[PDB]
Design a protein around this nucleic acid. Structure first.
Ligand code: DCP
Ligand code: CA
Ligand code: CA
Ligand code: CA
Ligand code: CA
Length: 341
DNA sequence: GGTTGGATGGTAG
DNA sequence: AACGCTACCATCCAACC
C-alpha cells in the first residue's frame, strides 16, 4: 500500500497571516489566555520567525514575551481555524475515498488504488499542495510511505512547506538509524525508559526479550515498536469517530469552595451540551486541574442517556467527591461527556 | 481469564 | 519556574461473568 499524509504548516499562525498579510516575515505568537491575569496563559503555536528564538507551543506566554517582547501576540481563534481546516479537508476528499482526519491540521489518504508507484504518489502530493495553495493560500507538508507511521515521519523530515517519500529502502535504513524517540507515540517518558534498556533505535526492540520490554513500557507500545521494526506495521486508514466532548476552564482564583466552583462547572456543561448536538452521552466525568497542574477526575456511567439536568446534579456530586478525596485547591474545572448513544 | 468501569498515565494536536 | 485547552488510547485495579 501507499499512504499520503498532510500536515498544515504552523497552522494557527498561518491562518492569521492569511487573514492579515502584514504579519508575514515577523514573529507571530498565537496564545491561549486563561483570564487569570493579564498575559497568563500558554502559546498554542508561533510562526517560524518567532520559533527561531525559542517561542514554541506549550510554553508560558510570560516566557515568550521575555524572549520576544515586540512580537505580535494574538488570541487563539479556534473556530476560525476549524472552519479553514474543514475547507482544506474537503479539498483532500477529492483525491481519495479513503481518508482519515487525524486532527485539526492532519489527514492520511490511502492512495494505493490511485497511483502505481512512489513517483506518481509524489506528483499527487505536489498536486495536493498546489490545490491547497490555490484555494486557501495555506502551505502544507506531505509525507508519503508504506504505512501511516512512516508517512508521518516523512512529513516531519520535510517540514516547512515540504514533500518527502520514504521508499522501502529508506524504511529499512530508518529502522536502523532513526532515534526511536522520534517515532510517533514515543514521548519523553517512554523514550527515557527505552534508553535505560539500551534501546536507541527501532531495530533494538528485536534484541530484547518481549516480556522485559512489555514490563517496562507496556504491551501496546512494545507490540507497536516491534511491528514497526519488523517492517510489518499496516494499520488501515479509517474514519475516526469522536468519542468524547468536553470543556475545562481556568477559574479566576484557586478554590475548594463548592459554591464558588459550581458556576464554572455549569458553564462548562452548557457549552459541552451545545457541542453534543443530538449526541446523548451515557457517561460524565468532572475533571479538576489542581494547584500544581495535576489532573483529578471523578466520573459515572449511567445505563441510559444523561439529560442536561441530570448532568448538572451529577456533576455537583462528582465535584463533591473530588473535594472530599483530594485536599488541594482546584485551579481549572471542567466536564467531559462520553459513551454516546 | 475477558469485559466493563473508574482513576490515572502518556501522548499529540 | 512560569503554564491552556481538546481529546485520543493505554494501564492498573476490582467487580462481575
Ligand atoms: N501544544 C499545542 C500544539 C498544537 N496546537 C495547535 C496549534 C497548531 O498550529 C496546531 C497543529 O499542531 P502542530 O504541532 O502541527 O503545530 P504547527 O502546525 O503550528 O507547527 P508545524 O509547522 O510543526 O506543523 O495545533 C495547540 O493548540 N497546542
Ligand atoms: Ca503533526
Ligand atoms: Ca502542523
Ligand atoms: Ca518523541
Ligand atoms: Ca468498580
Amino acid at each position: 500500500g501507499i499512504v499520503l499524509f498532510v500536515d498544515f504548516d504552523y497552522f494557527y499562525a498561518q491562518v492569521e497571516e492569511v487573514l492579515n498579510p502584514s504579519l508575514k516575515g515577523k514573529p507571530v505568537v498565537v496564545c491561549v489566555f486563561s483570564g487569570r491575569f493579564e498575559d497568563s496563559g500558554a502559546v498554542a503555536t508561533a510562526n517560524y520567525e518567532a520559533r527561531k528564538f525559542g517561542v514554541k507551543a506549550g510554553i508560558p506566554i510570560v516566557e515568550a514575551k521575555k524572549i520576544l517582547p515586540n512580537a505580535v501576540y494574538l488570541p487563539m481563534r479556534k473556530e476560525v481555524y476549524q472552519q479553514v481546516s474543514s475547507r482544506i479537508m474537503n479539498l483532500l476528499r477529492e483525491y481519495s475515498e479513503k481518508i482519515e482526519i487525524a486532527s485539526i491540521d492532519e489527514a492520511y489518504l490511502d492512495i494505493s488504488d490511485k497511483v502505481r508507484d512512489y513517483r506518481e504518489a509524489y506528483n499527487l502530493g505536489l498536486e495536493i499542495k498546489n490545490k491547497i495553495l490555490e484555494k486557501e493560500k495555506i502551505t502544507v507538508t506531505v509525507g508519503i510511505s508504506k504505512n501511516k507511521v512512516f508517512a508521518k515521519i516523512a512529513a516531519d523530515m520535510a517540514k516547512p512547506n515540504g514533500i518527502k517519500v520514504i521508499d522501502d529502502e529508506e524504511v529499512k535504513r530508518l529502522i536502523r538509524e532513526l532515534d526511536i524517540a522520534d517515532v510517533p507515540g514515543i514521548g519523553n517518558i517512554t523514550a527515557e525508559k527505552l534508553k535505560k534498556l539500551g534501546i536507541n533505535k527501532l531495530v533494538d526492540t528485536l534484541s530484547i526479550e518481549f516480556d522485559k520490554l512489555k514490563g517496562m513500557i507496556g504491551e501496546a507500545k512494545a507490540k507497536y515498536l516491534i511491528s514497526l521494526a519488523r517492517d510489518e506495521y499496516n494499520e488501515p486508514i479509517r474514519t475516526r469517530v469522536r468519542k468524547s466532548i468536553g470543556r475545562i476552564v481556568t477559574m479566576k482564583r484557586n478554590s475548594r469552595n463548592l459554591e464558588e466552583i459550581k458556576p464554572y462547572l455549569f458553564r462548562a456543561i452548557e457549552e459541552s451540551y451545545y457541542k453534543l448536538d443530538k449526541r446523548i452521552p451515557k457517561a460524565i466525568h468532572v475533571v479538576a486541574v489542581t494547584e500544581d497542574l495535576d489532573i483529578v477526575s471523578r466520573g459515572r456511567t449511567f445505563p441510559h442517556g444523561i439529560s442536561k439536568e441530570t448532568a448538572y446534579s451529577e456533576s455537583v456530586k462528582l465535584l463533591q467527591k473530588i473535594l472530599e478525596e483530594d485536599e488541594r485547591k482546584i485551579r481549572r474545572i471542567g466536564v467531559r461527556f462520553s459513551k454516546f448513544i
